Assembly symmetry: D2
Homo-oligomer: 366 residues x 4
Amino acid sequence: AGLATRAIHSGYRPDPATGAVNAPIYASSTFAQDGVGGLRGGYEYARTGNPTRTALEAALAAVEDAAFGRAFSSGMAAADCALRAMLRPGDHVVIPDDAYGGTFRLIDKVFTGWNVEYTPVALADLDAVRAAIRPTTRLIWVETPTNPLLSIADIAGIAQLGADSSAKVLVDNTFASPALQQPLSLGADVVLHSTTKYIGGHSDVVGGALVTNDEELDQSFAFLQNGAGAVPGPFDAYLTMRGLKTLVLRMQRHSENAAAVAEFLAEHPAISTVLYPGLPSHPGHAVAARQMRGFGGMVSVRMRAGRTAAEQLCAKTNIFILAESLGSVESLIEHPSAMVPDDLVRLSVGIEDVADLLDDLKQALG
Amino acid sequence: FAGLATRAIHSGYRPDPATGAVNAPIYASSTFAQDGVGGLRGGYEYARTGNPTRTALEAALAAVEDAAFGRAFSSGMAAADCALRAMLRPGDHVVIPDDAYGGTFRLIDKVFTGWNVEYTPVALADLDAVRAAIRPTTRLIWVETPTNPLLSIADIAGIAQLGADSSAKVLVDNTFASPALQQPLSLGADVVLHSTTKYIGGHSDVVGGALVTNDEELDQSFAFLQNGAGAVPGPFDAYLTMRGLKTLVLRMQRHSENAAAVAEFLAEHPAISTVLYPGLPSHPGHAVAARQMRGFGGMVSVRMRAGRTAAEQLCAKTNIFILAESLGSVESLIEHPSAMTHGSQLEVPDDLVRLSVGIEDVADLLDDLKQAL
Amino acid sequence: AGLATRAIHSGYRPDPATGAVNAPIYASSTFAQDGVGGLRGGYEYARTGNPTRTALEAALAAVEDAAFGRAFSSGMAAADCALRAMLRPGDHVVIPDDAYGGTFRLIDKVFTGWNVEYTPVALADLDAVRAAIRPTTRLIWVETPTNPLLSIADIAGIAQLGADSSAKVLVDNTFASPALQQPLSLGADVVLHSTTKYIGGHSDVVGGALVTNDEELDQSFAFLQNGAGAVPGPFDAYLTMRGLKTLVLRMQRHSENAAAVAEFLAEHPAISTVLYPGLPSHPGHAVAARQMRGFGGMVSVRMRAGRTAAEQLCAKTNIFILAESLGSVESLIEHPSAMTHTAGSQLEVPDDLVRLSVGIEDVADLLDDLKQALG
Amino acid sequence: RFAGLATRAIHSGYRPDPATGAVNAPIYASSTFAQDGVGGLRGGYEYARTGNPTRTALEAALAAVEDAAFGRAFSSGMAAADCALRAMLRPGDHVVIPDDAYGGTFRLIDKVFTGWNVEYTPVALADLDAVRAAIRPTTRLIWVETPTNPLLSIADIAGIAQLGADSSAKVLVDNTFASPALQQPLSLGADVVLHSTTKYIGGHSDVVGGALVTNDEELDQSFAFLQNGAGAVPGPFDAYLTMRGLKTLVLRMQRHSENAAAVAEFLAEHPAISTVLYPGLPSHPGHAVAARQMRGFGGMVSVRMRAGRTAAEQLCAKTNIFILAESLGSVESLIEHPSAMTGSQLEVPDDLVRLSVGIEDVADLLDDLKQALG
Ligand code: NA
């Protein structure tokens, strides 16, 4: 029933042969068959399907209340599979005007070379999103909150627009995670995760996922999953599943720490603007409150005194680690314009003691 | 650093300065602390883009192909996908084998054709036919030798020259021969692909692929899609692949010796009509194979005189050869391609059985085949 | 500063060479040297010491405010090191009368063979613990809360006894974990963990730990760690470090869930007694409140209808998993009398008793699960 | 499954999974196992320390390769050793040991077990009269290594087996150096065999582990008790690497022997070297015993340096392919100076260099030594 219970129990059942409570790590690329009966348990070749990956996919689908899940070697590999499944030459995709840099690079630098067209739009503006839809638009790419601005898109709003013009709607739910948002229950066709971030939760596994309720779409994902082979190894799939078992607990403490950080930096005179979906003054706050169970562990701030203040905050923290990525138990900090306005610093607030995080920020700010 | 066994062990990772660790550590870190914004440690910033275990692996792979550049991927097919997309755009054409690896044929035909890439399959053994397949739009010639499962041979130098002459790149998928038996960059290939799943890993426990090249520009174009599409290996698997590669040379020698003994036995056996093995003087392309390969490999295929039934029975009744997909493993494997794999390619005969001969004691392998037959 | 912060940051600093934020898994048994004995970072052979294990030891030490940490292949291996380091033939150990079955079996079955004597005692009775001390008593073996009865021992109180008689005091701090109890701040000489339980947290790594401030005792431990070689591999060490990083967060939820499960069972008519340190009426509650930051994730209950009802509860849960071990994110249930061997030297585990390791699943679910399972 | 040793090492430890057909033993990272009703075990598994599926597969593999009925794996060679000694000895008992034992074995016996009132006597194992004369009424164990570290001296396993039978004393052989691929001590009357699987069996210097195998079901049960009771148990990833390494043991050992024989030949002709120790050399003390009981003469060569301790140090410093590091039995060549690295034991001469010859191309290893010797 509950999501924490599902993250722990839903996708791997203790083995019949040994009772092993955890999905074993099947470091096998191939599988014995029976000359009369053929495959055992449907397994033939690891790329196509393997037991550990099946467990992961079953858990990923479970926590998004999806019928189907697919796991990939990276969040970008999931995005690549989604783009390639749902677009062809001559098609168009609407994208966010502030999407994840890797997504933008992929679409602008790769897919445009393969005769896919795209228009970025401020997703908060539903009339703007609708105007950006052409006869050739097959796909609407939604991110919410966005990386790094934490801007909000009305998933339900956009799904309606998708339905109205026969465009599919994908929601990249990395930041929010299954613990905070369920885009399928709001109308999305497909949900994408970089499991590298919150689901893994420990900065130790690169991975990705696609989940959906649409069986034809799942089969189209599977075709590219097997065919172009951007698939996770079993130790990594195991680590991902491991992380997922604590996601709900973790995202609660991320969100509580992140509110405390945003409140501190709201009052701190070096900071001009705090970007956090929990704040009533944040644009999109109301939309966030309706579609999110909690407001996430991400906080971005714009520094009063500009780029140089931003660089110096990033270099002076002793708990927040200056590094790319986000969604880890250890707080991370970066300067996105370098690594977006150049005075913006992005904070992935971890699960450390809050008094420590607030003291680290105070001393770093001077 | 001079011989290939030596390089395979020593070239890919030097013992750590800070600890002296003799093996590449498994860096299960997705990200990497910086000193000031963009003050990278050792060039590392985000594991998809680059990471220390995968760098070690890429060094080892480049070294055993005597290549300046190596790229590792989550699978052989991810390596194929990256190459195709790096070297082709809509409108372009690729010459491929008429008996290509099935996953390669499926990707080009069922995926890339819908991205306005065109192809022509050819008997690669016939250089006039290969030449005649090249269009003004041909940017790529895709070579596999030996091919799967007929073990047909292509003249990698002869095909390099046809590529040079029409400004098409030549990729050689060297999975079957491995770096131990065949070095296609030395013969004029632009790029070599492996499935490291097979012989390089050698133990049927890590899926992975590789691209290697001496062309800096081409390496940069693969890097772009490596990072961009993120079909990247994890560090445990990258480690397994490297560990696998440290015995490649030794394993392949025993693989070839065992395969030659199996080929010999099956050539004398009443139930077999045809033995396909690159080392037999009567194998088509044997003399090419002899010129470009150091040994003739661990794959043997046969056609059963009594047809599909005989082939099915053999695969069912082995007790040491394992009925399974894949090849290149220390344990012998057996497949009936017509039953176990899925106009434009050659039809694999339904009386054909493919043997991946492993490193077991040869007497036991021969006795297994004898009783199975 | 804060313990959750320390669990995250204290025992591995991001790598100078690469910045890697996590302790790399160094699968190397050996280490290159710069001319003979020119060691690199002090490494020479994995069993003696290796980088991943050093990181784990540094984390383990940090979370208990200990200067020294040593990791082993299991909690039992940590226990065997501790006993072999601190005892010799003819020495004696005072032990809990309801100790963890593995500790008792190792002492009663193996060490008695090697001429070490023991006396079990009710650790809650400080006069009885003191009475059990002989001139040959070199060690007092404290466990709190106990497995499976959850009895409480006054650590500071026992530590004073050890000091008075020159006997070292070890606390098996497994159940409580570092998040809830800090025995070295209370006078223990050594703290033991099975990191197989709460610290790993995910039932996926078997491991043990001995932490201490006494550099001489740590060197005795190191001698046996190296010499008898019950050492963890580096993937396992990494998993244990990984679990540790969310211990503080998880223990909080185990303790909340467990409070709820205990109150629930306490009013259920199938249950005759609830054993939970948090309950005011639990013997040792005031002692536990003094020394523990929270009351833990374990609850044991006695069934009004006897052994058969206990077996039927264990068989009927669909969320609690019927399996040994404890301190996992998944709720585990068991019937401990069925794994006990003891008569006369250890308290009898009642056959109507069910032990529950309450996980971090949604509490409503877990209560629904007990409710349907009880009938 | 089943005939030749290379076949067994591949096929005997795990049959492909009935549920999935997985060709390799899965890594079961589970400390516990669900039951069907209380005591209703699945496959007999209940708690990983006591038994777990990946360890079971490794123990089957280890047993099969020594033609043993019973296998036990441990977290290191030294944990295998500590288990053996605690299983077979009690205070007041005595063990006869080699006078040039592996340094860890000697340290555990002399520095740990003497304090638990176990006594020992070191003896030249090659001299069967001296082994015999070392045996007391309290002698319950004779501890045999052959070849010995690092002098590569030989002991007559069968002959020492008969001395043990004569005096009701169990015989254990540390078969680490020879490995199952070259020496089968149970076939020669040993009661138990021990390995550091860290060395040849794993092969790749990437997994610490040990093993005890036996045909004696009673002995196995005494080891099981302490495996479980003391818990020096391997993790399942490490167990997996050990099983994977074992899959190429027979193949690697053949090369290691060929490479080492050539390294011995080269060194014997080289004027910087006064003595070459290699079991395969006709003039090696114990060569005909070694020829009798070993299928090949192994990967280890030790040499003494004419110019003494300093030339030993210099050779160890100057190799570029042989890596200066402890341990042995790796696909990469290793070199060490045991007197610096590693009256109750034979002094290892300070001029001695121990070479663990790997599977690199022989011509590169000879060139490496030739340039390092100057
Ligand atoms: Na665990």
